[PDB]
Each structure stands twice: as structure tokens, then as C-alpha cells.
Design a protein around this ligand. Structure first.
Ligand SMILES: [Zn+2]
Ligand SMILES: [Zn+2]
Length: 74
């Protein structure tokens, strides 16, 4: 994927026991969030900002990695 250019494969929650950035374990209250740019699964602290994604033509939640990568490209 060119980030933001096409919808990524979303990792199913059933296949995502830990934040794919910081490694924290998901729990009853530490819940899963997908990045709309890369499709990986994160805790809120690692995935809480939004940016405009071309394939959506609107703002969507992205992870720490994709945010910096895309917001610079914009
Ligand atoms: Zn995290
Ligand atoms: Zn991402």
C-alpha cells in the first residue's frame, strides 16, 4: 500500500492480542483501535489522531507511524 491510497487489510481483533506499536496487552478496558492507513491494531495512546486519507476522502484514525508519515506527505 501507498499509505492512504487504498484501504488496507484490517487484522481481525481475534488475531490481535497486543498493541502493534507498544506491545501492551489488550484487556477489558485497554481496547483495540485499527489504523485506517495500515490496518494494524493499536491501543488508544498509539492510535488517537486523525488525518485525511485519500481512499476515504475524509479524516480517519491513524497510528503514530502513519500519522507522521502521511501528515508530512500532506
Ligand atoms: Zn500502544
Ligand atoms: Zn498505521
Amino acid at each position: 500500500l501507498v499509505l492512504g491510497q487504498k484501504q488496507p487489510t484490517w487484522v481481525p481483533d481475534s488475531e490481535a492480542p497486543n498493541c502493534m506499536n507498544c506491545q501492551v496487552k489488550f484487556t477489558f478496558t485497554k481496547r483495540r483501535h485499527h489504523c485506517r492507513a495500515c490496518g494494524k491494531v493499536f491501543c488508544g495512546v498509539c492510535c488517537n489522531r486523525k488525518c485525511k486519507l485519500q481512499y476515504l476522502e475524509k479524516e480517519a484514525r491513524v497510528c503514530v507511524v502513519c500519522y507522521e508519515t502521511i501528515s508530512k506527505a500532506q
